[PDB]
Amino acid sequence: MKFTPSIVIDAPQYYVDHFNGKYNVDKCVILRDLQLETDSESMPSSLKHLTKPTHILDLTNNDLIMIPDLSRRDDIHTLLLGRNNIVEVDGRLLPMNVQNLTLSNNSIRRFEDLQRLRRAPRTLKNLTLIGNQVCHLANYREHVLRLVPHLETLDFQNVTAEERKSAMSF
Amino acid sequence: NTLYVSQLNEKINMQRLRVNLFLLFATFGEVLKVSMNFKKQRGQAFITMRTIDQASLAQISLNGERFFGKPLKVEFSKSETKTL
Amino acid sequence: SLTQMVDVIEQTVVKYGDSIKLALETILWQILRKYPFGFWKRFATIEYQLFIAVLATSVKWFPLWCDYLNVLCVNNETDFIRNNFEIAKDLISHPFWDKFIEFEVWHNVQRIYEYIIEVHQYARFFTSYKKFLNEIDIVLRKTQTTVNEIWQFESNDD
C-alpha cells in the first residue's frame, strides 16, 4: 500500500529501452526507478532508498494525489505520472535536471495549480498535461507557455515563437 | 505485443520521437523497445510491449490521438518483433 | 423528463466551472428553442453567468417580458423603460405593471396609471389614483371591481 523501502529493494529493476538506468521498488506494491505501475501508490515517500541511481520513474496507474515528498535526486530526468489523480504540484520540487514530466490523465483543474512548474529552472523541456480538466479551460496553451517558457514541447506539440509572442500579448 | 503506428509528423528528430513515444505508451505497461529500428520516421514506429494486454489497451485507447499535430493511426504489427 | 435533462445539463455545467462550454450553451439555447417559462429564464440566467442579452431575446420570442425588463434594469434610460412598459402593457401580471409603473416614475406616469386602472389590480389602481391626486375615478373603480369579479370567477381539468 505505502511506498516503503522494503518495497524499494526488489521490483523488476532494469534499464529503460532508452538505456535510462534505474532500480525498481516492489516487495508487494508501488515502485520507483523504473515501473511504479499498478500498486495503488497514495503518497510518494521514502525516495531516499532510491539513493539516486535512476534516470526515470514510471509512476503510472497509481492513486497519487499530489507530487511532493521528493528527496533530492540529481539523476532523475523523466517522470511518467500517467493515470493517477494529481490535483496539485508541490512547488519546491526543484529536482535539478528534471527534463520530462508526464501528467497525462490526471485531475489538475486550475491554471494556478500549474504555476509550480515554472520553478523547474531550464530543464523541464517536455511536459504533457493532456487528459486533464485544465486543458479545456480557455487560453490553456498560452498560459502554460507564458508561465513556464522553459518548456520546448507541450502536449507533444512544439512551442513556437508565434504563440510565444501571443502569450506575451496576453 | 508490438504495435505499428503511422501518420506522424516526421519533422521530429528520431531521439525525441522515441522519447515521447516511450513516455506516452508507458501509461499502459512497460515498453520493451529502446529505439526505432526502421530509421525512416514518417510515423512508421513500432512499439514493443512486455505484456500483450498493454498492447491491446494502448491500441484501443490511443487510436487517432493528436501527437505532434497529427492523429496517429495504430494497428497490430504483421510479424513478431525480434526481441520478443 | 426533458426538464430533468435540462436541469441535469445545467448542474453538470455548473459543477464543471471554453469551446465545450460554447457548444453546451448552444445546446441549451436549442433546448429552450424546442421548449419555448421560468425554467427558460433560469437557463438564460445560467448562460449570463457563463459568459446575457440573449435573456431578452428569448423573452422577446416568448412574449414574462416584464421579468426580463426587471432583469435588464438589474443588469444596468427612460426611452427603453417606456418601450418596455408599453410592451408589458401589450403583454398584460399586476406586479408586472406595478414594476413598469415604478420604473417609469410625470403625466406619462399618470397616463400609465390611468391605463393600468382601466385594465391585486384594483388596489393598485386605487393607490395610483391616490398618488395621482397627491402629485371618472369611480367608473374605473367599478370597472376594476367587475374585472376582479371576473378574475375570481376565473381562478383534462385545466
Short mmCIF file of C-alpha atoms in Angstrom, two decimals:
data_model
loop_
_atom_site.label_atom_id
_atom_site.label_comp_id
_atom_site.label_asym_id
_atom_site.label_seq_id
_atom_site.Cartn_x
_atom_site.Cartn_y
_atom_site.Cartn_z
CA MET A 1 0.00 0.00 0.00
CA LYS A 2 2.56 2.55 1.14
CA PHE A 3 5.74 3.22 -0.79
CA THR A 4 8.31 1.95 1.70
CA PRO A 5 11.97 0.91 1.32
CA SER A 6 11.17 -2.78 1.79
CA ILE A 7 9.26 -2.28 -1.42
CA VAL A 8 12.15 -0.15 -2.82
CA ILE A 9 14.51 -3.06 -2.84
CA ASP A 10 13.00 -5.65 -5.17
CA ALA A 11 10.91 -4.61 -8.12
CA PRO A 12 11.67 -5.57 -11.68
CA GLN A 13 14.75 -3.38 -11.93
CA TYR A 14 16.38 -2.88 -15.31
CA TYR A 15 17.40 -0.32 -17.89
CA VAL A 16 14.95 1.62 -19.94
CA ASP A 17 14.72 0.99 -23.51
CA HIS A 18 16.26 4.47 -23.85
CA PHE A 19 19.13 2.93 -21.85
CA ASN A 20 17.99 5.12 -18.97
CA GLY A 21 19.10 3.44 -15.76
CA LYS A 22 17.23 2.73 -12.54
CA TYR A 23 16.47 0.20 -9.76
CA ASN A 24 12.85 -0.60 -9.09
CA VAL A 25 10.63 -0.82 -6.00
CA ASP A 26 8.34 -3.82 -5.32
CA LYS A 27 8.25 -6.01 -2.24
CA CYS A 28 4.49 -6.26 -2.73
CA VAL A 29 3.47 -2.87 -4.14
CA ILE A 30 4.42 0.50 -5.56
CA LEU A 31 7.63 1.05 -7.42
CA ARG A 32 10.37 3.60 -8.25
CA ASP A 33 13.29 3.84 -10.65
CA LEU A 34 11.50 2.01 -13.48
CA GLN A 35 7.98 0.69 -13.30
CA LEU A 36 6.00 2.25 -10.46
CA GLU A 37 2.92 0.81 -12.09
CA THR A 38 -0.31 -0.61 -10.71
CA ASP A 39 0.19 -0.99 -7.00
CA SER A 40 -2.01 1.83 -5.61
CA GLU A 41 0.52 4.47 -4.56
CA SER A 42 -1.30 7.00 -2.40
CA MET A 43 1.51 9.40 -1.42
CA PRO A 44 5.09 9.46 -2.73
CA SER A 45 7.59 8.94 0.08
CA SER A 46 10.76 7.07 1.03
CA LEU A 47 12.55 8.03 -2.18
CA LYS A 48 15.82 8.02 -0.25
CA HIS A 49 16.41 4.28 -0.66
CA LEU A 50 16.38 5.02 -4.38
CA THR A 51 19.75 6.53 -3.27
CA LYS A 52 19.95 8.42 -6.65
CA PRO A 53 20.62 5.78 -9.40
CA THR A 54 17.55 6.40 -11.53
CA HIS A 55 17.02 8.26 -14.77
CA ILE A 56 13.28 7.55 -14.97
CA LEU A 57 10.27 6.93 -12.72
CA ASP A 58 7.17 5.29 -14.25
CA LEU A 59 4.54 6.20 -11.62
CA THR A 60 1.64 5.48 -13.95
CA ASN A 61 -1.55 3.75 -12.77
CA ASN A 62 -1.40 4.63 -9.08
CA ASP A 63 -3.59 6.76 -6.81
CA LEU A 64 -1.27 9.71 -6.28
CA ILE A 65 -2.94 12.90 -5.08
CA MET A 66 -0.09 15.43 -5.28
CA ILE A 67 3.57 15.50 -6.29
CA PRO A 68 5.53 16.44 -3.15
CA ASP A 69 7.83 14.44 -0.89
CA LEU A 70 10.67 14.23 -3.41
CA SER A 71 14.07 13.83 -1.80
CA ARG A 72 16.92 15.47 -3.69
CA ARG A 73 17.51 13.26 -6.73
CA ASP A 74 20.14 14.60 -9.11
CA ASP A 75 19.80 11.71 -11.57
CA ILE A 76 16.04 11.68 -12.15
CA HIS A 77 15.39 13.05 -15.64
CA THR A 78 11.97 11.60 -16.53
CA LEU A 79 8.75 11.21 -14.54
CA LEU A 80 5.91 9.19 -16.11
CA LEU A 81 2.98 10.17 -13.91
CA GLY A 82 0.08 8.95 -16.10
CA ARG A 83 -3.25 7.56 -14.83
CA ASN A 84 -3.11 8.96 -11.31
CA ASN A 85 -5.20 11.65 -9.58
CA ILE A 86 -2.71 14.50 -9.26
CA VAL A 87 -4.69 17.51 -8.08
CA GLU A 88 -1.74 19.70 -7.14
CA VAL A 89 2.02 20.07 -7.57
CA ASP A 90 4.35 20.77 -4.65
CA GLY A 91 6.38 23.76 -5.79
CA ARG A 92 9.74 23.29 -4.15
CA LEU A 93 10.02 20.29 -6.48
CA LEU A 94 13.29 21.59 -7.96
CA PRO A 95 14.88 18.19 -8.63
CA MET A 96 17.54 19.76 -10.80
CA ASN A 97 17.55 18.44 -14.37
CA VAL A 98 14.00 17.03 -14.38
CA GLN A 99 13.70 17.30 -18.15
CA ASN A 100 10.44 15.44 -18.70
CA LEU A 101 7.12 15.36 -16.84
CA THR A 102 4.12 13.25 -17.90
CA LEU A 103 0.94 14.43 -16.20
CA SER A 104 -1.34 12.69 -18.72
CA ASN A 105 -4.79 11.67 -17.44
CA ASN A 106 -4.84 13.27 -14.02
CA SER A 107 -7.10 15.76 -12.22
CA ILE A 108 -5.39 19.15 -12.26
CA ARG A 109 -8.22 21.67 -12.52
CA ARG A 110 -6.84 25.21 -12.42
CA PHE A 111 -4.24 27.22 -14.30
CA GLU A 112 -2.90 28.45 -10.97
CA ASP A 113 -2.23 24.84 -9.98
CA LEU A 114 0.22 24.67 -12.90
CA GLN A 115 2.23 27.60 -11.51
CA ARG A 116 4.71 25.45 -9.59
CA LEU A 117 6.02 24.03 -12.89
CA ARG A 118 7.69 27.40 -13.54
CA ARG A 119 10.13 26.55 -10.74
CA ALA A 120 11.74 23.84 -12.91
CA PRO A 121 14.69 26.03 -13.90
CA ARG A 122 15.62 25.45 -17.54
CA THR A 123 15.46 21.65 -17.55
CA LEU A 124 11.74 20.86 -17.86
CA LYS A 125 11.83 20.72 -21.65
CA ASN A 126 9.00 18.22 -22.13
CA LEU A 127 5.67 18.43 -20.30
CA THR A 128 2.43 16.68 -21.23
CA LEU A 129 -0.80 17.68 -19.47
CA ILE A 130 -3.22 16.14 -21.99
CA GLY A 131 -6.06 14.31 -20.27
CA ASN A 132 -6.67 16.90 -17.53
CA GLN A 133 -9.63 19.19 -16.97
CA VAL A 134 -7.34 22.24 -17.01
CA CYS A 135 -6.70 21.65 -20.72
CA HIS A 136 -10.31 22.58 -21.51
CA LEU A 137 -10.11 25.98 -19.83
CA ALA A 138 -9.64 28.97 -22.13
CA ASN A 139 -6.13 30.07 -23.18
CA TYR A 140 -4.66 26.97 -21.53
CA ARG A 141 -1.83 26.58 -24.04
CA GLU A 142 -0.81 30.24 -23.99
CA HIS A 143 -0.90 30.38 -20.20
CA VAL A 144 1.38 27.35 -19.91
CA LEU A 145 3.78 28.98 -22.36
CA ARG A 146 3.85 32.34 -20.56
CA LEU A 147 4.07 30.62 -17.16
CA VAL A 148 6.80 28.07 -17.96
CA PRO A 149 8.69 29.27 -21.07
CA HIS A 150 11.28 26.58 -20.26
CA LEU A 151 9.02 24.05 -21.98
CA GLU A 152 10.16 23.28 -25.52
CA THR A 153 7.41 20.77 -26.33
CA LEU A 154 3.96 20.95 -24.74
CA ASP A 155 1.38 18.17 -25.15
CA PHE A 156 3.78 16.72 -27.72
CA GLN A 157 3.32 19.93 -29.70
CA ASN A 158 6.27 22.24 -30.02
CA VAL A 159 6.09 25.69 -28.51
CA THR A 160 6.90 28.00 -31.47
CA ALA A 161 7.71 31.70 -31.33
CA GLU A 162 4.32 32.66 -32.76
CA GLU A 163 2.35 31.54 -29.73
CA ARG A 164 5.22 32.67 -27.51
CA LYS A 165 4.51 36.18 -28.81
CA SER A 166 0.75 35.74 -28.44
CA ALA A 167 1.40 34.62 -24.86
CA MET A 168 3.33 37.87 -24.43
CA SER A 169 0.49 39.90 -25.96
CA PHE A 170 -1.83 38.47 -23.33
CA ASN B 1 2.87 -7.34 -28.31
CA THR B 2 4.19 -4.90 -30.90
CA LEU B 3 2.05 -2.10 -32.30
CA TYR B 4 2.67 -0.41 -35.66
CA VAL B 5 1.96 3.32 -35.65
CA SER B 6 2.00 5.59 -38.70
CA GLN B 7 0.73 9.02 -39.81
CA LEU B 8 3.08 11.02 -37.56
CA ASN B 9 4.87 14.33 -38.05
CA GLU B 10 8.21 13.10 -39.41
CA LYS B 11 9.73 16.55 -38.79
CA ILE B 12 10.52 15.47 -35.22
CA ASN B 13 14.02 14.17 -34.67
CA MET B 14 14.48 10.45 -34.08
CA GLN B 15 15.53 10.54 -30.42
CA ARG B 16 12.81 13.00 -29.37
CA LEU B 17 10.22 10.95 -31.24
CA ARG B 18 11.35 7.81 -29.42
CA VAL B 19 11.40 9.50 -26.00
CA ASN B 20 7.90 10.94 -26.49
CA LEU B 21 6.57 7.59 -27.73
CA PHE B 22 8.02 5.69 -24.77
CA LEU B 23 6.64 8.39 -22.48
CA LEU B 24 3.15 8.28 -23.98
CA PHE B 25 2.88 4.48 -24.12
CA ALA B 26 4.35 3.85 -20.66
CA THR B 27 0.89 4.51 -19.19
CA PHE B 28 -0.34 1.09 -20.36
CA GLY B 29 2.67 -1.04 -19.45
CA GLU B 30 6.40 -1.40 -19.81
CA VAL B 31 7.61 -0.64 -23.33
CA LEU B 32 10.49 -3.00 -24.15
CA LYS B 33 11.69 -1.29 -27.35
CA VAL B 34 14.64 1.05 -26.88
CA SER B 35 14.87 2.63 -30.32
CA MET B 36 13.14 2.65 -33.69
CA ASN B 37 14.88 0.10 -35.89
CA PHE B 38 13.29 1.41 -39.08
CA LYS B 39 15.29 4.70 -39.02
CA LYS B 40 12.89 6.28 -41.54
CA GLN B 41 10.44 8.18 -39.25
CA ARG B 42 7.31 9.09 -41.34
CA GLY B 43 5.17 7.75 -38.48
CA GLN B 44 6.26 4.16 -39.06
CA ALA B 45 7.22 3.41 -35.47
CA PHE B 46 6.92 0.03 -33.77
CA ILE B 47 6.29 -0.10 -30.02
CA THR B 48 7.07 -3.38 -28.28
CA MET B 49 5.32 -4.19 -25.03
CA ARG B 50 6.19 -6.82 -22.43
CA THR B 51 2.62 -8.00 -21.86
CA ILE B 52 0.02 -8.33 -24.61
CA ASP B 53 -2.85 -6.70 -22.70
CA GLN B 54 -0.93 -3.42 -22.58
CA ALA B 55 -0.54 -3.56 -26.37
CA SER B 56 -4.28 -4.11 -26.87
CA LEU B 57 -5.18 -1.39 -24.35
CA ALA B 58 -2.80 1.09 -25.98
CA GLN B 59 -4.25 0.24 -29.40
CA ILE B 60 -7.87 0.83 -28.37
CA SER B 61 -7.27 3.87 -26.16
CA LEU B 62 -4.79 5.82 -28.30
CA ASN B 63 -6.39 5.49 -31.73
CA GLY B 64 -6.24 8.80 -33.58
CA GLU B 65 -4.57 10.62 -30.69
CA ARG B 66 -3.16 14.02 -31.60
CA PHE B 67 0.61 13.54 -31.33
CA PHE B 68 2.87 16.33 -32.63
CA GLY B 69 0.00 17.80 -34.65
CA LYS B 70 -1.27 14.63 -36.27
CA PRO B 71 -3.80 11.93 -35.28
CA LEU B 72 -1.77 8.74 -35.04
CA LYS B 73 -3.00 5.55 -36.69
CA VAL B 74 -2.28 2.42 -34.67
CA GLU B 75 -2.51 -1.24 -35.74
CA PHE B 76 -1.06 -4.58 -34.70
CA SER B 77 2.25 -5.46 -36.34
CA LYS B 78 2.27 -8.07 -39.10
CA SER B 79 5.15 -10.08 -37.61
CA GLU B 80 6.62 -10.68 -34.17
CA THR B 81 9.44 -8.41 -33.04
CA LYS B 82 12.94 -9.91 -32.98
CA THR B 83 13.26 -9.08 -29.28
CA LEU B 84 10.06 -10.96 -28.41
CA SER C 1 -38.41 14.13 -18.41
CA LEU C 2 -36.90 16.73 -20.73
CA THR C 3 -36.88 19.34 -17.95
CA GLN C 4 -34.96 16.92 -15.74
CA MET C 5 -32.44 16.56 -18.59
CA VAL C 6 -32.06 20.35 -18.87
CA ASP C 7 -31.60 20.64 -15.11
CA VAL C 8 -29.01 17.85 -15.27
CA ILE C 9 -27.10 19.60 -18.07
CA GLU C 10 -27.18 22.90 -16.17
CA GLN C 11 -25.99 21.25 -12.95
CA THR C 12 -23.18 19.37 -14.70
CA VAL C 13 -22.03 22.54 -16.46
CA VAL C 14 -22.16 24.35 -13.12
CA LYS C 15 -20.08 21.64 -11.47
CA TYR C 16 -17.54 21.92 -14.29
CA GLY C 17 -16.84 25.61 -13.69
CA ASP C 18 -14.31 27.28 -23.40
CA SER C 19 -15.42 25.85 -26.74
CA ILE C 20 -17.08 22.93 -24.95
CA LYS C 21 -18.97 25.44 -22.81
CA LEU C 22 -19.96 27.24 -26.02
CA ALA C 23 -21.37 24.05 -27.54
CA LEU C 24 -23.16 23.45 -24.23
CA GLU C 25 -24.66 26.94 -24.38
CA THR C 26 -25.78 26.31 -27.96
CA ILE C 27 -27.33 23.02 -26.81
CA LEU C 28 -29.11 24.89 -24.01
CA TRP C 29 -30.43 27.58 -26.37
CA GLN C 30 -31.58 24.83 -28.75
CA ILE C 31 -33.39 23.12 -25.87
CA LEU C 32 -35.04 26.43 -24.97
CA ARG C 33 -35.98 26.77 -28.64
CA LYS C 34 -37.62 23.35 -28.55
CA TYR C 35 -39.45 24.08 -25.31
CA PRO C 36 -40.35 27.83 -25.99
CA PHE C 37 -41.12 29.88 -18.88
CA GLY C 38 -39.23 30.23 -15.62
CA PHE C 39 -37.01 27.26 -16.46
CA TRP C 40 -36.03 29.05 -19.66
CA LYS C 41 -35.29 32.16 -17.59
CA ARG C 42 -33.12 30.06 -15.26
CA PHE C 43 -31.26 28.63 -18.25
CA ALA C 44 -30.74 32.15 -19.62
CA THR C 45 -29.51 33.39 -16.23
CA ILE C 46 -27.12 30.43 -16.11
CA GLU C 47 -25.86 31.43 -19.56
CA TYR C 48 -25.47 35.02 -18.35
CA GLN C 49 -23.39 33.62 -15.50
CA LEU C 50 -21.46 31.50 -18.00
CA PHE C 51 -20.05 34.24 -20.24
CA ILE C 52 -26.76 37.98 -21.08
CA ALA C 53 -28.67 39.83 -23.78
CA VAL C 54 -29.99 36.51 -25.07
CA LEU C 55 -32.17 36.53 -21.93
CA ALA C 56 -34.01 39.42 -23.58
CA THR C 57 -34.09 37.69 -26.98
CA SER C 58 -35.70 34.51 -25.61
CA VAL C 59 -38.29 36.56 -23.72
CA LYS C 60 -38.92 38.54 -26.90
CA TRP C 61 -39.55 35.27 -28.73
CA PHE C 62 -41.79 34.09 -25.88
CA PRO C 63 -43.91 37.37 -25.50
CA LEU C 64 -42.63 37.21 -18.78
CA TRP C 65 -41.50 40.27 -20.70
CA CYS C 66 -41.50 42.33 -17.52
CA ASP C 67 -39.36 39.72 -15.79
CA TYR C 68 -36.78 40.33 -18.50
CA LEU C 69 -37.39 44.06 -18.06
CA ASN C 70 -36.59 43.90 -14.34
CA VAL C 71 -33.61 41.68 -15.14
CA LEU C 72 -32.43 44.23 -17.71
CA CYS C 73 -32.82 47.01 -15.15
CA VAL C 74 -30.81 44.82 -12.76
CA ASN C 75 -28.16 44.37 -15.45
CA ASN C 76 -27.95 48.15 -15.90
CA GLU C 77 -32.87 55.07 -19.95
CA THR C 78 -36.38 56.49 -19.88
CA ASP C 79 -36.96 55.63 -23.55
CA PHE C 80 -36.02 51.96 -23.14
CA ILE C 81 -38.09 51.77 -19.95
CA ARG C 82 -41.06 53.27 -21.80
CA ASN C 83 -40.63 50.85 -24.72
CA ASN C 84 -40.53 48.07 -22.12
CA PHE C 85 -43.60 49.35 -20.23
CA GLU C 86 -45.63 49.63 -23.45
CA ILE C 87 -44.50 46.12 -24.43
CA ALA C 88 -45.61 44.92 -20.99
CA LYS C 89 -48.98 46.63 -21.36
CA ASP C 90 -49.19 44.84 -24.70
CA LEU C 91 -48.34 41.61 -22.87
CA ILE C 92 -50.73 42.18 -19.97
CA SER C 93 -49.46 40.32 -14.25
CA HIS C 94 -50.39 43.02 -11.75
CA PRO C 95 -46.89 43.06 -10.20
CA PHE C 96 -45.51 43.31 -13.74
CA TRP C 97 -47.43 46.51 -14.49
CA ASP C 98 -46.59 47.66 -10.96
CA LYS C 99 -42.87 47.23 -11.70
CA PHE C 100 -43.24 49.06 -15.03
CA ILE C 101 -45.05 51.98 -13.37
CA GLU C 102 -42.44 52.07 -10.59
CA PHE C 103 -39.63 52.14 -13.16
CA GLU C 104 -41.37 54.83 -15.21
CA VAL C 105 -41.81 57.03 -12.13
CA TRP C 106 -44.85 62.87 -14.81
CA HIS C 107 -48.02 62.94 -16.89
CA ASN C 108 -46.77 59.89 -18.77
CA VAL C 109 -46.66 58.07 -15.44
CA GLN C 110 -50.19 59.35 -14.81
CA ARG C 111 -51.34 58.04 -18.19
CA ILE C 112 -49.71 54.69 -17.41
CA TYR C 113 -51.51 54.69 -14.04
CA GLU C 114 -54.81 55.51 -15.77
CA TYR C 115 -54.33 52.75 -18.35
CA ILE C 116 -53.38 50.30 -15.59
CA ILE C 117 -56.54 51.32 -13.75
CA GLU C 118 -58.52 50.78 -16.95
CA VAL C 119 -57.19 47.26 -17.46
CA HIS C 120 -54.19 42.93 -6.75
CA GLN C 121 -55.21 45.08 -9.70
CA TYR C 122 -57.95 47.21 -8.13
CA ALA C 123 -55.92 48.05 -5.02
CA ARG C 124 -53.02 49.10 -7.24
CA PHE C 125 -55.47 51.25 -9.23
CA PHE C 126 -56.73 52.92 -6.04
CA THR C 127 -53.14 53.57 -4.93
CA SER C 128 -52.40 55.03 -8.37
CA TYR C 129 -55.43 57.32 -8.06
CA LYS C 130 -54.31 58.49 -4.61
CA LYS C 131 -50.76 59.06 -5.87
CA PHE C 132 -52.05 60.97 -8.90
CA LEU C 133 -54.08 63.19 -6.58
CA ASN C 134 -51.01 63.57 -4.36
CA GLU C 135 -48.86 64.83 -7.24
CA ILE C 136 -64.08 59.42 -13.74
CA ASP C 137 -62.26 57.55 -10.98
CA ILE C 138 -65.40 55.84 -9.67
CA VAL C 139 -66.23 54.48 -13.13
CA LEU C 140 -62.76 52.94 -13.34
CA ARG C 141 -63.22 51.62 -9.79
CA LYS C 142 -66.49 49.89 -10.74
CA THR C 143 -64.93 48.52 -13.93
CA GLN C 144 -61.94 47.17 -11.99
CA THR C 145 -64.42 45.71 -9.48
CA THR C 146 -66.17 43.83 -12.30
CA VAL C 147 -62.77 42.75 -13.65
CA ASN C 148 -61.76 41.45 -10.22
CA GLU C 149 -65.08 39.58 -10.07
CA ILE C 150 -64.21 38.05 -13.45
CA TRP C 151 -60.70 37.16 -12.22
CA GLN C 152 -62.12 35.49 -9.11
CA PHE C 153 -64.55 33.68 -11.42
CA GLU C 154 -61.55 32.56 -13.49
CA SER C 155 -59.29 31.24 -10.74
CA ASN C 156 -58.45 17.49 -18.62
CA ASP C 157 -59.34 19.52 -15.53
CA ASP C 158 -57.29 22.55 -16.56
#
